[model samples]
Target: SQEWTLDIPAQSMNSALQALAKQTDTQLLYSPEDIGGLRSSALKGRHDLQSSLRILLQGTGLRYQIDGNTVTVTASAAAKDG
Candidate 1:
């Protein structure tokens, strides 16, 4: 039942992710260059936390790892959290 209408525009991944986190009331930590200034696609319509995250990261060559209230964004082929 955790879902909502997320209408986000195609913006820099840094801001995109932060926007999602702000809208969802969640926490996120990442580096500025992790996304390399890539612009995320517009994520409009209804979606849950998981789907919303994936949708926001579409084609950005990145991935997310969630832990409690914190979401860690990183490269897809990167090693596990160390």
Candidate 2:
């Protein structure tokens, strides 16, 4: 819910996720295929964690789930298992 100010360029999807994971001091797991062909925008802003992710992943058909310190990026609830 709360999370980092990372000014990342068009990095690989996994790298973007990794940055977030490190910023929030959490663990993130995902599939390369799941986020294939997706690149992050120039996410340079000062905002909260969730909103920052929303902006970064806007229109990437991706979402995040934070269970304790583990944040998994996946589809909607029905399709999430990572």
Candidate 3:
């Protein structure tokens, strides 16, 4: 899909993940528990997919990878270098 028109305020980690899943038309799931009780901050604005996910997971130490039109979320091994 096109870059999403977004407004994702800080909230549950999984909640924003779900929104991202819907927007990207992909599958997103966790360990069935938000182990960190992760609360995400607002990720607002129209964004390119890369910018969108990066902002959504910013400061949370998470990373997303897309394989065959599917996005998978996982803990970041380290901060992104860029």
Q: Which candidate tops TM-score?
A: 1
CA lDDT of each prediction against the hidden true structure? 0.77, 0.70, 0.67
User: Which one wins on lDDT?
Assistant: 1
Instruction: List where candidate 1 sits over 4 angstroms from the true fold.
Output: 78-82
Worst 10 residues of 2 by lDDT: 1-10
Return whichever of 1 and 3 wins on lDDT.
1
Error of 3 at 19 (Å): 1.5
Pairs that clash in candidate 3: 8-42, 8-43, 9-41, 9-42, 10-40, 10-41, 10-42, 11-40
Clashing pairs in 2: none
Relative to the true structure, candidate 2 has a C-alpha RMSD (angstroms) of 4.1
Instruction: Give per-residue CA lDDT, model 2, range 1-82, as digits (tens).
Output: 2435565567788777777777767688788777765777757666776666677777766677767777677777455534
Decide which is better by lDDT, 2 or 3. Answer: 2
lDDT digits (tens) for residues 2-79 of candidate 3: 677875646777677677677667676564374376787667677776667776666766666766556777775765
